[PDB]
Every structure is written in structure tokens, then in C-alpha cells.
């Protein structure tokens, strides 16, 4: 989605400031975690796949 992540608050709006920051940091954490795992898990499967193909080639022979 089209987003402008940035926001500006004054010296009397510290609470929504920290609400905004909580939104940015909660999404950061979710994405970071998911992206790391998605890689770790698909990398396992890829390498298994490659092993799987060789095996099937040798087995066919």
C-alpha cells in the first residue's frame, strides 16, 4: 500500500507519538521475524529438493 511512514507531533502529544512508534516497531518485529524464518525454512526445502532430484536420478538408473 502507498504509505508515508513519517508523522509529526508537538511537545504535548507524546502519547500518540509513542502509539505511532509502537505501530512502527510492532510491524518491524513481525516482518523481521517472518522474513528470517521464511528464508530458513524455504532454504531447507530447496536443498532437500535438490537432494531429492539426484536421489531419483540415481534410483532410476
Amino acid at each position: 500500500q502507498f504509505t508515508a511512514v513519517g508523522k509529526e507531533f508537538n511537545h504535548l502529544e507524546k502519547r500518540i507519538e509513542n502509539l505511532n512508534k509502537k505501530v512502527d516497531d510492532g510491524f518491524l518485529d513481525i516482518w523481521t521475524y517472518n522474513a528470517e524464518l521464511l528464508v530458513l525454512l524455504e532454504n531447507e526445502r530447496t536443498l532437500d529438493y535438490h537432494d531429492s532430484n539426484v536421489k531419483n536420478l540415481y534410483e532410476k538408473v
Binding site: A4, V5, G6, K7, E8
Partner: protein, 163 residues
Amino acid sequence: SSFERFEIFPKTSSWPNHDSNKGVTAACPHAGAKSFYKNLIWLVKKGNSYPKLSKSYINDKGKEVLVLWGIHHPSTSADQQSLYNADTYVFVCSSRYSKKFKPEIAICPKVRDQEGRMNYYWTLVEPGDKITFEATGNLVVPRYAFAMERNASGIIISDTPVH
């Protein structure tokens, strides 16, 4: 998407009973000379009277118009009397917006060689709406407004070059 700046209340014609030249200060120097904002006019009394001010503007532009004005708050009553009247008010209202202002006269901490204050106000005028300014003093008046249409973005604070 459709921004433009236009003279809303011409200096030459809009203020016949008031002074529009003497509205400069050392706080806003131009060429090292006492100046003021280009988009607002600081009105001072003409001769020795500041008659009830009454000016209105209908938005003929096919879009929203952005109006800004200022309320002046002098430090001393001697200063107040010399620029403008003793008991004064400023009144602005459209069909949507409406606020009265009351000049708080007081000696504040000195900022930029200035012991007075000037509060800055703004509102959006609907396409086809009327906005009325009324005053007996202290009103920094609009000279330039902006016509526009918005698009649902942000602000970057950077030293990074443009290309």
C-alpha cells in the same frame, strides 16, 4: 495537485481607513532593514483612529482556499495605544469556522529582541463559502491566500541532494 498563490485582499485598495506601510519590524529583517511577511499585512492606525474593520471574501476558486492571519499581543499599553484604541477584539468566521480573539497585553521574555507575542491562525474555506474578518485592532491581516486540492503524503527532513 492544484496549488497556487493569489492576492486575496490587495494592499493598494482593500484597507482605505488603515495604514498598511508602517507594519514592519526589526524581528523580520529583509536586506538588513525592518520588514515583515509577504503573505500578511500588519495594519497600524491611520492618523489617530483605528475604525472598526470589516472585510469579507467569497471563494470563487473551484477548490479549497487556505487563509492565514495573525493576532498581535503587544507588551505594553503605551505600545498598544500607539499602534491601534484600548479595549479591542478580532473576530473571524466562515460558514464552518468561527472564533473571537482577545488581545492579551503583557511583557513576555525577550525573543529576537521582542517582548511581545504574535499568534498565527489558519483555516480552509469551502469552494463557494464566505469568510469574514472583523476587528478593532491587533489583527495581522491576510494579503495572500493559497488555492489548492489535496492528495491523501509526508515530510522528509534531510540534507540529501535532489536529482
